[PDB]
Design a protein around this motif. Sequence first.
Motif, PDB file in Angstrom:
ATOM      1  N   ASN A   1       0.793  -1.222   0.000  1.00 35.67           N
ATOM      2  CA  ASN A   1       0.000   0.000   0.000  1.00 35.67           C
ATOM      3  C   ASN A   1       0.830   1.279   0.000  1.00 35.67           C
ATOM      4  O   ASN A   1       0.474   2.264  -0.646  1.00 35.67           O
ATOM      5  CB  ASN A   1      -0.928   0.003   1.209  1.00 35.67           C
ATOM      6  CG  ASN A   1      -1.982  -1.069   1.129  1.00 35.67           C
ATOM      7  OD1 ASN A   1      -2.290  -1.574   0.050  1.00 35.67           O
ATOM      8  ND2 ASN A   1      -2.517  -1.454   2.279  1.00 35.67           N
ATOM      9  N   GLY A   2       1.935   1.264   0.737  1.00 35.61           N
ATOM     10  CA  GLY A   2       2.804   2.424   0.814  1.00 35.61           C
ATOM     11  C   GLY A   2       2.098   3.510   1.603  1.00 35.61           C
ATOM     12  O   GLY A   2       1.567   4.449   1.012  1.00 35.61           O
TER      13      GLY A   2
ATOM     14  N   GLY B   1      -0.383   4.693   2.225  1.00 39.31           N
ATOM     15  CA  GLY B   1      -1.663   5.201   1.772  1.00 39.31           C
ATOM     16  C   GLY B   1      -2.723   4.147   2.009  1.00 39.31           C
ATOM     17  O   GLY B   1      -2.508   2.972   1.709  1.00 39.31           O
ATOM     18  N   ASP B   2      -3.869   4.554   2.550  1.00 39.23           N
ATOM     19  CA  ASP B   2      -4.955   3.610   2.772  1.00 39.23           C
ATOM     20  C   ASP B   2      -5.607   3.225   1.447  1.00 39.23           C
ATOM     21  O   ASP B   2      -6.134   4.081   0.735  1.00 39.23           O
ATOM     22  CB  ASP B   2      -5.987   4.227   3.719  1.00 39.23           C
ATOM     23  CG  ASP B   2      -7.129   3.284   4.033  1.00 39.23           C
ATOM     24  OD1 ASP B   2      -6.949   2.380   4.876  1.00 39.23           O
ATOM     25  OD2 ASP B   2      -8.213   3.460   3.442  1.00 39.23           O
TER      26      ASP B   2
ATOM     27  N   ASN C   1      -9.561   3.675   0.773  1.00 40.22           N
ATOM     28  CA  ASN C   1      -9.978   4.957   0.223  1.00 40.22           C
ATOM     29  C   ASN C   1      -9.989   4.928  -1.300  1.00 40.22           C
ATOM     30  O   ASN C   1     -10.827   5.567  -1.935  1.00 40.22           O
ATOM     31  CB  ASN C   1      -9.062   6.074   0.719  1.00 40.22           C
ATOM     32  CG  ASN C   1      -9.355   6.474   2.148  1.00 40.22           C
ATOM     33  OD1 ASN C   1     -10.481   6.333   2.624  1.00 40.22           O
ATOM     34  ND2 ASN C   1      -8.339   6.972   2.843  1.00 40.22           N
ATOM     35  N   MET C   2      -9.054   4.185  -1.884  1.00 38.25           N
ATOM     36  CA  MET C   2      -8.987   4.067  -3.334  1.00 38.25           C
ATOM     37  C   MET C   2     -10.157   3.214  -3.816  1.00 38.25           C
ATOM     38  O   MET C   2     -10.293   2.051  -3.437  1.00 38.25           O
ATOM     39  CB  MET C   2      -7.652   3.461  -3.767  1.00 38.25           C
ATOM     40  CG  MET C   2      -7.340   3.631  -5.244  1.00 38.25           C
ATOM     41  SD  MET C   2      -5.598   3.343  -5.611  1.00 38.25           S
ATOM     42  CE  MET C   2      -5.596   3.512  -7.395  1.00 38.25           C
TER      43      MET C   2
ATOM     44  N   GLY D   1      -0.527  -0.121  -9.988  1.00 42.34           N
ATOM     45  CA  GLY D   1      -0.778   0.618  -8.764  1.00 42.34           C
ATOM     46  C   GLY D   1      -2.082   0.213  -8.106  1.00 42.34           C
ATOM     47  O   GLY D   1      -2.168   0.118  -6.881  1.00 42.34           O
ATOM     48  N   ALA D   2      -3.101  -0.023  -8.925  1.00 41.01           N
ATOM     49  CA  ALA D   2      -4.409  -0.437  -8.429  1.00 41.01           C
ATOM     50  C   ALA D   2      -4.371  -1.866  -7.895  1.00 41.01           C
ATOM     51  O   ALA D   2      -5.077  -2.201  -6.944  1.00 41.01           O
ATOM     52  CB  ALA D   2      -5.454  -0.308  -9.525  1.00 41.01           C
TER      53      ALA D   2
ATOM     54  N   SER E   1      -2.747  -2.059  -4.367  1.00 42.26           N
ATOM     55  CA  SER E   1      -3.700  -1.590  -3.371  1.00 42.26           C
ATOM     56  C   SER E   1      -4.771  -2.643  -3.108  1.00 42.26           C
ATOM     57  O   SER E   1      -5.251  -2.788  -1.984  1.00 42.26           O
ATOM     58  CB  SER E   1      -4.338  -0.272  -3.815  1.00 42.26           C
ATOM     59  OG  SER E   1      -3.420   0.801  -3.699  1.00 42.26           O
TER      60      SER E   1
ATOM     61  N   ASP F   1      -4.928  11.038   1.379  1.00 41.29           N
ATOM     62  CA  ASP F   1      -5.425  10.012   0.469  1.00 41.29           C
ATOM     63  C   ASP F   1      -6.490  10.606  -0.445  1.00 41.29           C
ATOM     64  O   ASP F   1      -6.590  10.243  -1.618  1.00 41.29           O
ATOM     65  CB  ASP F   1      -5.981   8.814   1.239  1.00 41.29           C
ATOM     66  CG  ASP F   1      -4.890   7.926   1.801  1.00 41.29           C
ATOM     67  OD1 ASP F   1      -4.193   7.268   1.001  1.00 41.29           O
ATOM     68  OD2 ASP F   1      -4.733   7.880   3.039  1.00 41.29           O
TER      69      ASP F   1
ATOM     70  N   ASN G   1      -5.090  13.027  -8.824  1.00 46.70           N
ATOM     71  CA  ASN G   1      -5.231  11.996  -9.844  1.00 46.70           C
ATOM     72  C   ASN G   1      -6.324  12.339 -10.842  1.00 46.70           C
ATOM     73  O   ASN G   1      -6.139  12.202 -12.051  1.00 46.70           O
ATOM     74  CB  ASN G   1      -5.524  10.636  -9.212  1.00 46.70           C
ATOM     75  CG  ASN G   1      -5.700   9.544 -10.250  1.00 46.70           C
ATOM     76  OD1 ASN G   1      -4.764   9.207 -10.977  1.00 46.70           O
ATOM     77  ND2 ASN G   1      -6.903   8.992 -10.331  1.00 46.70           N
TER      78      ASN G   1
ATOM     79  N   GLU H   1      -5.828  13.064 -14.817  1.00 51.47           N
ATOM     80  CA  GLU H   1      -6.534  12.215 -15.771  1.00 51.47           C
ATOM     81  C   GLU H   1      -7.536  12.988 -16.630  1.00 51.47           C
ATOM     82  O   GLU H   1      -7.674  12.714 -17.822  1.00 51.47           O
ATOM     83  CB  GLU H   1      -7.217  11.041 -15.067  1.00 51.47           C
ATOM     84  CG  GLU H   1      -6.241  10.033 -14.480  1.00 51.47           C
ATOM     85  CD  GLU H   1      -6.869   8.670 -14.270  1.00 51.47           C
ATOM     86  OE1 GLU H   1      -7.971   8.606 -13.687  1.00 51.47           O
ATOM     87  OE2 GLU H   1      -6.258   7.664 -14.692  1.00 51.47           O
TER      88      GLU H   1
ATOM     89  N   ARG I   1       2.381  11.341  -2.044  1.00 49.58           N
ATOM     90  CA  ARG I   1       1.295  10.366  -1.956  1.00 49.58           C
ATOM     91  C   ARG I   1       0.789   9.876  -3.314  1.00 49.58           C
ATOM     92  O   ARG I   1       0.561   8.681  -3.498  1.00 49.58           O
ATOM     93  CB  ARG I   1       0.137  10.916  -1.118  1.00 49.58           C
ATOM     94  CG  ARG I   1      -0.986   9.920  -0.885  1.00 49.58           C
ATOM     95  CD  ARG I   1      -0.487   8.671  -0.189  1.00 49.58           C
ATOM     96  NE  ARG I   1       0.195   8.978   1.064  1.00 49.58           N
ATOM     97  CZ  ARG I   1      -0.410   9.039   2.244  1.00 49.58           C
ATOM     98  NH1 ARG I   1      -1.715   8.814   2.330  1.00 49.58           N
ATOM     99  NH2 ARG I   1       0.285   9.323   3.337  1.00 49.58           N
TER     100      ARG I   1
ATOM    101  N   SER J   1       3.395   7.670  -4.946  1.00 45.57           N
ATOM    102  CA  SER J   1       3.380   6.403  -4.223  1.00 45.57           C
ATOM    103  C   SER J   1       2.148   5.552  -4.532  1.00 45.57           C
ATOM    104  O   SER J   1       2.259   4.351  -4.779  1.00 45.57           O
ATOM    105  CB  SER J   1       3.466   6.657  -2.718  1.00 45.57           C
ATOM    106  OG  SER J   1       2.811   5.634  -1.989  1.00 45.57           O
ATOM    107  N   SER J   2       0.977   6.180  -4.516  1.00 45.42           N
ATOM    108  CA  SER J   2      -0.284   5.457  -4.658  1.00 45.42           C
ATOM    109  C   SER J   2      -0.703   5.182  -6.105  1.00 45.42           C
ATOM    110  O   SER J   2      -1.351   4.172  -6.381  1.00 45.42           O
ATOM    111  CB  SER J   2      -1.406   6.184  -3.912  1.00 45.42           C
ATOM    112  OG  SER J   2      -2.600   5.422  -3.925  1.00 45.42           O
ATOM    113  N   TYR J   3      -0.346   6.078  -7.022  1.00 54.33           N
ATOM    114  CA  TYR J   3      -0.815   5.967  -8.404  1.00 54.33           C
ATOM    115  C   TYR J   3       0.284   5.701  -9.439  1.00 54.33           C
ATOM    116  O   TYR J   3      -0.008   5.433 -10.606  1.00 54.33           O
ATOM    117  CB  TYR J   3      -1.650   7.192  -8.796  1.00 54.33           C
ATOM    118  CG  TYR J   3      -2.839   7.420  -7.889  1.00 54.33           C
ATOM    119  CD1 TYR J   3      -4.079   6.868  -8.187  1.00 54.33           C
ATOM    120  CD2 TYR J   3      -2.719   8.168  -6.726  1.00 54.33           C
ATOM    121  CE1 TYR J   3      -5.166   7.065  -7.357  1.00 54.33           C
ATOM    122  CE2 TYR J   3      -3.801   8.372  -5.891  1.00 54.33           C
ATOM    123  CZ  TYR J   3      -5.021   7.816  -6.211  1.00 54.33           C
ATOM    124  OH  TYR J   3      -6.099   8.015  -5.381  1.00 54.33           O
TER     125      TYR J   3
END
Lengths: 440, 440, 440, 440
Positions: free
Chosen positions: B368-369, B371-372, B375-376, B405-406, B409, D74, D81, D85, D106, D109-111
């Motif tokens: 996850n890094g 990041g929750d 939430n995604m 990335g998805a 998560s 988040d 994002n 996009e 973030r 990291s997340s995307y």
Amino acid sequence: PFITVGQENSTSIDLYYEDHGTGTPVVLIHGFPLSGHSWERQSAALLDAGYRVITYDRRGFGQSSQPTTGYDYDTFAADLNTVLETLDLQDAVLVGFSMGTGEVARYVSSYGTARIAAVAFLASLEPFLLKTDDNPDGAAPQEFFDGIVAAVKADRYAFYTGFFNDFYNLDENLGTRISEEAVRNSWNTAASGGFFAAAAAPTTWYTDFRADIPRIDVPALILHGTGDRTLPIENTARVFHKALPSAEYVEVEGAPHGLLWTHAEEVNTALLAFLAKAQEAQKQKLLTEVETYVLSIIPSGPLKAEIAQRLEDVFAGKNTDLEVLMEWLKTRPILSPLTKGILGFVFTLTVPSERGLQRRRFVQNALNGNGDPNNMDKAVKLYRKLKREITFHGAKEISLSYSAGALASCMGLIYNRMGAVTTEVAFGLVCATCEQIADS
Amino acid sequence: PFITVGQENSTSIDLYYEDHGTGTPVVLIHGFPLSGHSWERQSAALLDAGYRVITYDRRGFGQSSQPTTGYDYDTFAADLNTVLETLDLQDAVLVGFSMGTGEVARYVSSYGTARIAAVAFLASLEPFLLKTDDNPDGAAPQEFFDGIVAAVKADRYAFYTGFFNDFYNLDENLGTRISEEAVRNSWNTAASGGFFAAAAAPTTWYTDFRADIPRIDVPALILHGTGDRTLPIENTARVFHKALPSAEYVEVEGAPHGLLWTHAEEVNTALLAFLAKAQEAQKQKLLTEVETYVLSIIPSGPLKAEIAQRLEDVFAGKNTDLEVLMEWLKTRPILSPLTKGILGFVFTLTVPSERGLQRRRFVQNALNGNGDPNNMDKAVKLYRKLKREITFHGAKEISLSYSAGALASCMGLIYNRMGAVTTEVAFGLVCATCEQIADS
Amino acid sequence: PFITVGQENSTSIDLYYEDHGTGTPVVLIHGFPLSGHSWERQSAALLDAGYRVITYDRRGFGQSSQPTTGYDYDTFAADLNTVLETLDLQDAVLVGFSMGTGEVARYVSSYGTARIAAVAFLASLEPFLLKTDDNPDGAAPQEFFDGIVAAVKADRYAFYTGFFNDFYNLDENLGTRISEEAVRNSWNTAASGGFFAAAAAPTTWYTDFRADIPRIDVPALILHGTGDRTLPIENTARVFHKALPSAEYVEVEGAPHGLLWTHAEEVNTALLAFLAKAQEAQKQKLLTEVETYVLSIIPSGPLKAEIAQRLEDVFAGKNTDLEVLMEWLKTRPILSPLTKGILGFVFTLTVPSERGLQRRRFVQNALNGNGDPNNMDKAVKLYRKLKREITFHGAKEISLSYSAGALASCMGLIYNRMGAVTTEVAFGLVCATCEQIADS
Amino acid sequence: PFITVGQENSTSIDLYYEDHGTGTPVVLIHGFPLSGHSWERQSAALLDAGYRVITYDRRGFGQSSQPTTGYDYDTFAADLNTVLETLDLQDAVLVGFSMGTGEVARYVSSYGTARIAAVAFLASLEPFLLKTDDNPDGAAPQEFFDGIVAAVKADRYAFYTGFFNDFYNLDENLGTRISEEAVRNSWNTAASGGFFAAAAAPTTWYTDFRADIPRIDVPALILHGTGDRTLPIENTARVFHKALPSAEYVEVEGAPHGLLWTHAEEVNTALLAFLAKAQEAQKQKLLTEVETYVLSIIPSGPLKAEIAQRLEDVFAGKNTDLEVLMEWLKTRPILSPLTKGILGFVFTLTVPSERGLQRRRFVQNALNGNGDPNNMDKAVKLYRKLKREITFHGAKEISLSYSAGALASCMGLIYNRMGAVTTEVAFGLVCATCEQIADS
């Protein structure tokens, strides 16, 4: 018959043309100062060889309109484009003579070889007639051509007499290769042309085609007589051959500028040879492409080899029985219905002698694809696009955008005869159908 | 319940079928001249063992449509293909009896083992029943089978009596292994079939399956009774075993042709065993797939060897400590954070005794890094899709549509909220996650 | 397969039916208390003889709906009408057995022989079973039939046993012409029927068909067994033959009421003979009509005789070459293009083996008719009408309302395959086309 | 301009944004408690340097919606994002300030760094502000941040005054590096924000970005002022540099937290330098694409080499004479007119000092497109589409749908100055024109 290529004042500009025979279209573009009827010796031969002969008269020449404008090769080539598009000619061969070679070169360069299969240049002007500093391979300087224009303007009728003397090399050929009456007819055709067009045409002769030559990608033939007085072999064909080394080069010994009539036998032989050879050359490259694509979906084994063999046999022209082939296909043990269906489509399409087999159910049931209305919707949409298409590469790309299910139904539409597309396009479809199946 | 497999004239061709239970799909293909209900003793056992039982009636048999066409194994296999695709079965096991064995062989051969996990052949026809010169291991010549067809046509109802006499070996088994009432029911089922199908079926028995056999790649089981009167063991199963030596071979002593009922206990035992074995066999191929995918992201070196060994150990059942493994993972150098996370995910998933270890922080931070993932939204929508999924191949394909990335998560959600997806699906995700990383 | 013929309360009334084979439609109407499957011995034979076999189960019998209403021959015939119209059967032959003869008689009388080509009556009820004052040729009085109804109501299952004893004449035929198992199946079929329908059916047996008989205009066959116990030959077939002397009369010696199975060989022979003979009888009368009409437009001379000869040859079935015939037509000296065109249409239509001739231009150019948009407008309007039409006399009358120019284009539409009409209608069109030309 | 990032009750959550200039996209993410307009000094510099500047306001800040939810990084990263996009930015550079640095870390990291080319962190929060046992390098404990929130809740307006006192280090910088009016505006922007967002924002400051840092793979820049009172250098940037040693580290001496304005000169210099490395990298990849496309139409020879060299020279910045180049182009004997036109278009477009050279006749006549009114119409339709376009890849794709004749005329529209398109779009057109020509 006429084709409107423009408009001059209150009048319209129409070109007289003729469309004869059935087969691959061969367009014959005449030279100065004659008309489409000049090809009659070639035209007679080409019709025997099962070709579709198309001839037309240049503006201000023969039976065409005689305007006082548009006497430049950009307009001449634009006219040819209109002619090709009006008749919707596909995979056609352009044959030019004298001035006519200029039209071929310019059109190919400016409009592309989309509709063109091959090109032939007889008694060419190319690459550049004008003798200048940058072009020492020119035949004569500017002042010379200015003399011709002034000569025509002086008296075009009297000019024609002197013109045809070197056009046919009458001192040599008169009474031997060309009759007095034949020349008489040529003079009449010359006089029948426009007064303006007559003197406007020579200014077009020193056109620089050097930039047009590299754009020739289709198979080419360069023919020229050594005894050519009007256009000296060395200032034309010989240097043209250096510019286009890929082209088939033919030198007819002792032939004059007007060899279409005098040395018609040598011309026909050379031309019909080039046409038949270039045709089979593109037939083989097309059929080998179809073979590889069709075999791609067949699973490796003894059956794949057997299929490959029967495919080669029909492609080679070995008249195989179709009822037997279809019964053989129907009775195969590991072959999938779609595979059998595609194969059924390919065999009926390539076999010349259908022998009398009604559209088989096993092929129809294979291509319908569950009879999904979703599939038949995309199939007609694709069918509309393929009707406009002609190139195999062009037909394949636009078909690939459709799903394998939609493609199979589209093939079914054509098979059932609810569709009318050219063989090159039909092969484009089947190859695209095979490609999608291979990736699934 | 019906599935449309074709169309005959004004009518459509539908096959009656039954879908029971939850688990891996087991398709039971009945023999002549009965129906899907013949499997009732097997179906009952298979349902108890937590399988999904799918049975259907062949065309012209039982409750299925009775057309007068398509009585050949190419059509029979096409019907089966429709059934499997309509229900969209994945990783399923095909079990055939008598004629049903022919369908299994042909489908596998013609359509591939994509949806198939394993195959079973009980009282097989294979490889070739016809006694010829090239095939001396045949049971009887052409003339014999012509007699049967003529026998059925004479009086199919009277034929059934004589048929079931040798089908069950009634002189031996009647009153012992099969009751009068049970046979009575079998006779009724036979009569219920199509008159045309009745006489059309015997001609299919001498089908040459010798070419279909090599195309069998999935795990196979070959079962046959020694006391088989209809299909003599030596002309069928024994030579079949030589053609397919990889297959699990079971010989039921003194069992007749209709051993499905008479020796049901022996049949059930052998079949459930083979199924249990094929599960562990596909479990191994599943772990080897996971290993290669996980190993794909780890850079070559001494660490890669250490991981591969530790992966093999946990896969083999060599119960390693998890607190030690996780502590071992946490302290590894050169490892990308994502790489440690994936391995941590795999280890908690594969280690049986989790012992009672709280969800590691370092894995959460690795995948996850910080990041929750909850939430995604994209992670949850994929999680929603994976909850419905059951197969590994099915879970992997749908996961590949999502970005790397998805996916990471999504793995984090399962690890965090102590995910409730099957292990097979969970492995699909991790392999799909590894695949995206392996490319970019 | 089912066809909805009505509605009873919350439920709908559907009839189970079967459609097999390709050719002229032969409808087989079963008797009491069986189902369509009873014809299986006849059905098997008719399919071999290249017929299209259609069978259905009467309401409350076999697999059909079991309502508690509509058990009268007006409803039975109404159901048959729905069946014939739903399937859109054309030039079909109705074959009835026992109760089934009543349906044939009533339908023909009430709905006309439009779709009917011929009729056959096997083990007929006709003309009147009830023994009364006005009808002394009755088999039994009212009180008797009331006994049967009460017998069925008492116990239908036990009734069936005693019923089939006289249905098949078991004391004679059991073990010789009918097996124990065959009878067993018949009993099952009987029990499978509706409880209400079982006892409601006998009340229909004493229906007065005397008024229906005169309305039979199509060729008829009357077959009956002398050993018929259920329906005594003398009270039925013998008096029926006096009412319909035109009918082909067949008396099968020693045959019981159920001769469809027992004396199947005699039945098939007689029926297939009657069908083939009645078919060729209507083929000849149709072709001789076409001949006279086509010859009407050809001018008298040696050419007219030659045409008449080649027409007779193809009509007789002498497989003549079509490429030769068409080349012969194309090369004729005094024949008008329209005449050649009509002739071209007629030859392709009648020649079975097209051999593989692409649609000839000379025929196409003859039928187009100057390509007038006025002519092609009327041609599609007529084409719409002819698609609905089936009778030759019916197709000819509606076509005559159109001009000769419109008719020629309509023929061109069909020839080009932009149209799909039956041969009888196609002949109607050509005869109408010839008629208009003859009066011009 | 707005971008919808969510929904709160009856209302939707939209973020105010701005898109200016043409070139590589540079996203500027503001800090607390200001808005996108805070970058105005950077935007001015970046626009001069030929960048595409994109700024947006965080939720509850500036002109953005003021919801009472989603105040966590988040959600902040999810918003970013959506922005990236929606605008479909590719190869973009993210630049963050104060709170804005959190979004960058973030999101990356997340995307993933798919759309990102590089990242910049100015006055960063990273890695962790909270002072705990596991994190002793924190600036302040939990209790402290709770004080700020309570301070804002007491009176946010009065809070803003005290906040900007340490934000800009006013005792030092007021009247020197920042004016009274400038601060006044900053205060207005603060008050303009949401009351809820104001007190909700400080809780996000102690977010743990330590796990996000390793996931940064694109080139990074870390800038920070030593005189930073809000975010002490040692607790932020210095320890951040240890976590990300690969990053380019810049320490601006004596700069406060709001150094974006006060030390704008030092900031811009450092930023534009870091950006220039990534920008020149993407400029070359654009020019190499144009080169390959332009060279694609030039025929092989010594001339092709000469053109490629002169192209490389102008792309490199070697100020070549244009008057000489154009005369050189005009005088080439083998170059097609269209080819000369395209090259002429490219040279005028790429050559900086056009030196006031009048629109060449030879280029205009090449691009006119035979003055076909049909070609001129399609060119305008395309011009309308290109006016809306901004990206090179986007401009090339939509242009490919038009014919080669239509494309040449469209280039003529722009060349003649009857059209106004951006350089990236202009290159898209010329490349699309070359692609059509290459395919003929």
